[PDB]
C-alpha cells in the first residue's frame, strides 16, 4: 500500500536551525551565479565574436523565426535549459543591434 | 680504504664507494624529500600542532 503510506506519512516534528551561518569549506568555495571574470568574457566575445551556429541563430531571431531558432539551438546544444538561455542571450544581441 | 679517504668529501663519489643498496633504493627519494610539503601544510601543522592529552569520564 505504497500510495496510502506515502499519503498518511507524518514527518517527525523537528526544529530547524535558525541562527548559524555556514563556515566556507576549504576547496569548495564558489559563487556560482557570478562565476567567471565578466570583463574577461566580454573581451573574448569582442575578439572572437560568435560561433557559426550562433550567427545563424541571430539570423533566425532577426528574421522573426524564433520558433525555428529554438529547434535549431536545441539540436545544436542538445539541452533545453542551455537552449533557452542561449536564445535570450542571443535576442539581447539582436535587440542592441 | 685509500680511495674512500681520497673521495670522501667529493661532490660525486665513485660508484665503488657508495653503498650498493639496490637500484630501486638508490633511486628512492630521501627522507628529507618525502617530508617536503607545501606552505599550507606547514602553516597548518605549525598553527595546529600535535596535542598531548588524556580523557576520562
Amino acid at each position: 500500500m505504497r500510495k496510502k503510506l506515502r499519503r498518511m506519512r507524518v514527518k517527525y516534528p523537528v526544529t530547524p536551525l535558525v541562527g548559524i551561518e555556514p563556515i566556507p569549506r576549504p576547496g569548495k568555495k564558489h559563487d556560482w551565479n557570478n562565476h567567471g571574470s565578466p570583463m574577461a568574457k566580454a573581451i573574448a566575445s569582442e575578439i572572437c565574436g560568435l560561433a557559426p551556429y550562433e550567427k545563424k541563430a541571430l539570423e533566425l531571431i532577426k528574421s522573426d523565426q524564433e520558433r525555428k531558432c529554438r529547434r535549431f539551438l536545441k539540436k545544436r546544444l542538445g539541452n533545453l535549459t542551455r537552449t533557452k538561455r542561449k536564445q535570450e542571450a542571443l535576442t539581447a544581441i539582436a535587440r542592441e543591434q | 680504504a685509500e680511495m674512500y679517504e681520497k673521495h670522501k668529501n667529493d661532490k660525486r663519489m665513485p660508484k665503488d664507494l657508495r653503498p650498493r643498496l639496490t637500484k630501486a633504493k638508490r633511486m628512492a627519494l630521501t627522507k628529507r624529500q618525502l617530508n617536503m610539503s607545501v606552505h599550507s601544510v606547514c602553516k597548518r601543522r605549525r598553527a595546529y600542532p600535535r596535542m598531548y592529552f588524556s580523557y576520562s569520564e
Binding site: 526544529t15 530547524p16 569549506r25 576549504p26 | 596535542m51 598531548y52 592529552f53 588524556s54 580523557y55 576520562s56
Partner: protein
C-alpha cells in the same frame, strides 16, 4: 532434475569462481588485537578512538535509532567554541560534508563536544604525557547507550486531554 523441490539457483557454472576460505580468521584476530594494543601503547595518554557525533540513521526503517557518526560539522565545533582544525588535534573527528540539518542533532553534538573537552587533561609534550600515569580510555568515546524503550504511561482520565 526430478522431484518437487525449489528450482536450483546454484551459480557454480563459471569455472572462474574462486573460494575465500577463512583459515586465517583466528590468526587475524590475534594479529588485530596485537596491533590495537600497539596503537594504544604508541598513543599512551590519548584515547585510541576519535570523539564521534551522534547522528540519526537515514531511512524510514532506521530513523527510530541513532548511531555514531563520522565527524562533527565545523559549525558544531564553532558553537562548541573550537576551531575545527584545532578540534582535529585533540581527538575529535570533523566531517566537512555533513549538513547541519536541525537543532536537535546540532545541540546534541555541540553538547557532546563540550562534555568531551571538559573531560580532557592536557600535557606539555610527549615526555610529560607518557609519565602522567593517567589511565587512557579504551573503546568508543561516549557511545550512545542501547536500551529497550521505556513504555510511557498516562492516566486514563488524561487520555482524552492529551489525544482528542
Amino acid at each position: 532434475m526430478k522431484h518437487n523441490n525449489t528450482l536450483p539457483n546454484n551459480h557454480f557454472k563459471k569455472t572462474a569462481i574462486r573460494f575465500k576460505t577463512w583459515f586465517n580468521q583466528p590468526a587475524k584476530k590475534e594479529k588485530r588485537i596485537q596491533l590495537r594494543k600497539e596503537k594504544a601503547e604508541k598513543m599512551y595518554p590519548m584515547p585510541v578512538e576519535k570523539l564521534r557525533p551522534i547522528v540519526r540513521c537515514s531511512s524510514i526503517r532506521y530513523n527510530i535509532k541513532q548511531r555514531l557518526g563520522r565527524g562533527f560539522t565545523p559549525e558544531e565545533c564553532r558553537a562548541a567554541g573550537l576551531d575545527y582544525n584545532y578540534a582535529r588535534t585533540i581527538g575529535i573527528a570533523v566531517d566537512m560534508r555533513r549538513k547541519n540539518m536541525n537543532k536537535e542533532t546540532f545541540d546534541q553534538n555541540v553538547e557532546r563536544i563540550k562534555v568531551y573537552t571538559s573531560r580532557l587533561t592536557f600535557y606539555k609534550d610527549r615526555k610529560e604525557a607518557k609519565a602522567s600515569g593517567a589511565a587512557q580510555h579504551i573503546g568508543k568515546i561516549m557511545p550512545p547507550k542501547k536500551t529497550p524503550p521505556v513504555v510511557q504511561t498516562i492516566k486514563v482520565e488524561e487520555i482524552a486531554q492529551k489525544f482528542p
